[PDB]
């Protein structure tokens, strides 16, 4: 198989750059339209990360920062699959996540929220997807986060995730939420996304059969990245 370029990103399935409802986007959004280009080797290539460099607890947010005891909060496992738009699994992709603790408090110098800090929780982890595009990490369910967009704004509970896969054109950063959270319907950030079906694509579903008795609950969340088209005639990539 001789691969061609990645399929065109469908701008309609993503939030626009300018979204007045999400205030900080007003000054941090280009006024000019993005210039689309035909892909070259630069856009279809991406770095490789060896698993040798990852620690044993890198995907365990419950223990990778635990000092004196366990973090306070809801023990939950999150897993799922990473595929490209054509359904092909994405192997060995770097998945990085970060979140606030159970109080909705981030371990970051710029966070002054009254929510209590957890000395045993860090809030960040990472993993590589396997040959089936499968990924899995453990964590404490994050609490909603109050922030200043409009004075009384509240982010629904959420986990930040980033992916670096096979092509630079696939570079993606986003956030996923938990099924049933009532704050999902009023979040200005989630509302930057035009369609309803795309908003639901960011919701992790309760996976009851995979709950671990007297231990942890579990959420299922699949991620879809752009996919490459195969070439059967001219190969103009190079």
């Amino acid at each position: 198989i001789i691969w061609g370029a990645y399929a065109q990103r469908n701008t309609e399935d993503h939030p626009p750059a300018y979204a007045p409802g999400y205030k900080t986007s007003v000054l941090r959004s280009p006024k000019n339209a993005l210039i689309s280009i035909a892909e070259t080797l630069s856009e279809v290539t991406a770095p490789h990360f060896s698993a040798d460099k990852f620690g044993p607890k890198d995907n365990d947010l419950i223990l990778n920062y635990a000092k004196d005891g366990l973090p306070i909060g809801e023990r939950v496992i999150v897993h799922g699959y990473v595929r490209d738009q054509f359904g092909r699994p994405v192997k060995n992709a770097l998945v990085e996540v970060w979140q606030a603790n159970a109080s909705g408090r981030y371990r970051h110098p710029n966070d002054q929220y009254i929510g209590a800090m957890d000395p045993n929780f860090g809030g960040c982890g990472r993993m590589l997807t396997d040959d089936n595009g499968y990924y899995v990490f453990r964590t404490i369910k994050p609490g909603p986060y109050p922030w200043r967009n409009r004075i009384n704004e509240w982010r629904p509970a959420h986990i930040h995730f980033s992916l670096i896969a096979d092509g630079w054109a696939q570079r993606l950063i986003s956030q996923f939420y938990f099924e049933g959270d009532t704050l999902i319907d009023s979040c200005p950030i989630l509302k930057t996304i035009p369609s309803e079906q795309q908003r639901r694509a960011l919701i992790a579903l309760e996976d009851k059969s995979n709950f671990i008795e007297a231990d942890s609950r579990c959420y299922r969340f699949d991620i879809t990245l752009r996919g490459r088209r195969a070439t059967y005639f001219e190969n103009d990539l190079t």
């Binding site: 750059a17 941090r28 006024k31 490789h48 738009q85 110098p109 990245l225």
Partner: protein, 202 residues
């Protein structure tokens, strides 16, 4: 066919998950950074630095940047590179950094990339692919860094020439400087207003 997962801003605390140490979090033994040059990395060392400004001309003190580039011979350390040439075995080709919380300055210690093949047998001028993530930015912004000392190559670059508004091409050219004996390319990014940096949908 599935739709691509919708993008969301990295948020103000993007450092927690992508640059733990900058957020004072020591959890990983191996931390990804802004240093692409190793002991046996080939090519001339260079420093890429600058700032990112908003629509008010103010620097973003919470922006995160990543770069992707080829080695000194124009070969990407990626299995997707089809050139058939052996890449520099001591080069990841990727780096990440964050603007300084106080000044807004960012920088990478890397190597000047070699010319990479373009489409239809063309040749691209040396460049570094760069992406911007930050609060207020809904989707990572893509752009490229070219070098002013490669005027001849830039004039023939396919991507730069695909921009019909010629006056904007210069926003993608970094300026070479020399702090003593070190080569430094200054690249300031302007998200909005005049001299707004060109951004690509790749």
């Amino acid at each position: 066919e599935l739709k691509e997962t919708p993008s969301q801003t990295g948020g103000p605390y993007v450092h927690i998950g992508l640059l733990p140490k900058q957020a004072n979090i020591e959890v990983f033994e191996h931390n990804l950074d802004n240093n692409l040059v190793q002991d046996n990395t080939q090519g001339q060392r260079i420093r890429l630095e600058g700032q990112v400004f908003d629509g008010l001309g103010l620097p973003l003190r919470d922006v995160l940047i990543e770069i992707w580039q080829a080695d000194t011979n124009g070969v990407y350390p990626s299995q997707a590179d089809t050139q058939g040439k052996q890449v520099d075995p001591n080069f990841l080709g990727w780096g990440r950094t964050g603007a300084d919380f106080g000044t807004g300055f960012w920088s990478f210690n890397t190597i000047k990339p070699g010319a990479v093949p373009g489409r239809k047998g063309s040749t691209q001028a040396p460049h570094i692919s760069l992406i911007i993530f930050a609060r207020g930015i809904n989707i990572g912004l893509h752009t490229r860094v070219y070098f002013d000392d490669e005027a001849e190559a830039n004039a023939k670059d396919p991507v730069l020439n695909s921009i019909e508004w010629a006056t904007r091409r210069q926003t993608l050219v970094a300026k070479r400087e020399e702090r003593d004996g070190e080569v430094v390319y200054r690249f300031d990014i302007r998200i909005q207003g005049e001299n707004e940096t060109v951004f690509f949908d790749i």
